[PDB]
């Protein structure tokens, strides 16, 4: 195995395959990157046995086919540490990989390519392509609502749902829900899958922002995403995600509109004096007014009064302020609409000007 590649063209691939390869690995080979030269292409693979990252680098300079595994972080650091425009000459020399550029020389320990975990091939059941910005939006709009190490393991991931020409992301922790729908301009079959937390993080991480579209392929127990010459593959969460459609309030009688920033700032201030563990705040809704109150065990109290657009019956609803703030911070719009039923039923929060994302927050007592 031998190849010579320009640093700037090895960097992003190494960053995309080695970036997710973190911490003390289970097997030592998991801390390694599989390098394979074949057909004028260098393939770089990083794995954790569940999720896989494969990058393909075109070799426009002389090369010799072969394969080996090298410590990922050390190899990335060497290439990154080399100067701008550096030509990186790589060669396998026994049980060690040689890296040469200018007057810089490195000999890395190898582990056999044959010992590298090869993930079984699988058949894609649903596939579609979409802009990176659309995937970013779908994830960012709902990611915060995913559960954190919940016993209901299926809640620690994000649901990816296809229906007609829409791709939808759903995330819930059983207390609050986030749902984002985006039109994808391709007729899709009705499919629903749960992507694990780490797969979600990686899907976000792989989005460079650029012109490259993202090609998603979903199988029965795996998901793969292609962006340029990078292939991210993740196992799916084998579980049944709750039905978001049921969770959505049927026909709310009460509708409140407020400036997102004024509302956010009032909640952020009341949050300071709320219970550190329970984060409970009280909302008192009245004609064109919202009063937010918070108190903690040390009997400290916060009160905020805001002008809102509310034409309905006066009501008092309790909420975990963190859940509300998470929604208000995820919204990034001028005005928000809160759709309420009663004090013991969930609120739906959305951008007053858009129904693409909806946030359902169950109240407290």
């Amino acid at each position: 195995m031998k190849f010579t590649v320009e640093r700037e063209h090895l960097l992003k691939p190494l960053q995309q395959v080695s970036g997710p390869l973190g911490g003390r690995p289970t097997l030592p080979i998991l801390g390694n990157l599989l390098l394979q030269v074949a057909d004028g292409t260098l393939s770089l693979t990083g794995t954790d046995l569940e999720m896989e990252m494969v990058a393909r680098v075109a070799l426009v300079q002389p090369h010799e086919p072969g394969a080996t595994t090298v410590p990922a972080r050390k190899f990335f650091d060497i290439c990154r540490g080399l100067p701008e425009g550096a030509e990186i000459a790589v060669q396998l020399e026994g049980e060690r990989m040689l890296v040469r550029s200018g007057r810089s020389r490195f000999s890395l320990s190898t582990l056999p390519a044959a010992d590298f975990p090869n993930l079984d091939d699988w058949q894609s059941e649903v596939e579609f392509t979409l802009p990176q910005a659309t995937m970013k939006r779908l994830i960012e709009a709902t990611q915060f609502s995913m559960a954190h190490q919940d016993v209901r393991y299926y809640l620690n991931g994000m649901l990816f749902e296809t229906e007609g020409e829409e791709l939808r992301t759903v995330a819930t922790d059983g207390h609050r829900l986030a749902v984002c729908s985006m039109p994808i301009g391709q007729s899709l079959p009705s499919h629903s899958v749960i992507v694990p937390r780490k797969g979600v993080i990686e899907l976000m991480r792989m989005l460079d922002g650029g012109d490259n579209p993202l090609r998603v392929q979903i199988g029965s127990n795996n998901i793969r995403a292609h962006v340029g010459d990078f292939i991210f593959t993740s196992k799916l969460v084998d579980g049944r995600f709750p039905d978001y459609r049921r969770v959505l309030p049927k026909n709310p009688d009460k509708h409140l509109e407020a400036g997102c920033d004024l509302l956010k700032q009032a909640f952020a201030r009341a949050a300071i004096l709320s219970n550190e563990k329970f984060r409970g705040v009280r909302l008192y809704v009245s004609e064109n007014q919202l009063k937010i109150t918070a108190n903690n065990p040390e009997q400290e109290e916060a009160e905020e009064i805001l002008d809102v657009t509310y034409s309905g019956a006066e009501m008092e609803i309790g909420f975990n302020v963190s859940y509300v703030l998470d929604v208000l911070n995820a919204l990034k719009c001028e005005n928000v609409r809160m759709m309420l039923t009663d004090s013991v039923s969930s609120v739906q929060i959305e951008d007053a000007a858009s129904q693409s994302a909806a946030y359902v927050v169950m109240p407290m007592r």
């Binding site: 819930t172 207390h175 709750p242 049921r246 969770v247 169950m362 109240p363 407290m364």
Partner: peptide, 5 residues
């Protein structure tokens, strides 16, 4: 804290 489901 009430639950959605």
């Amino acid at each position: 804290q009430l639950d959605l489901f």
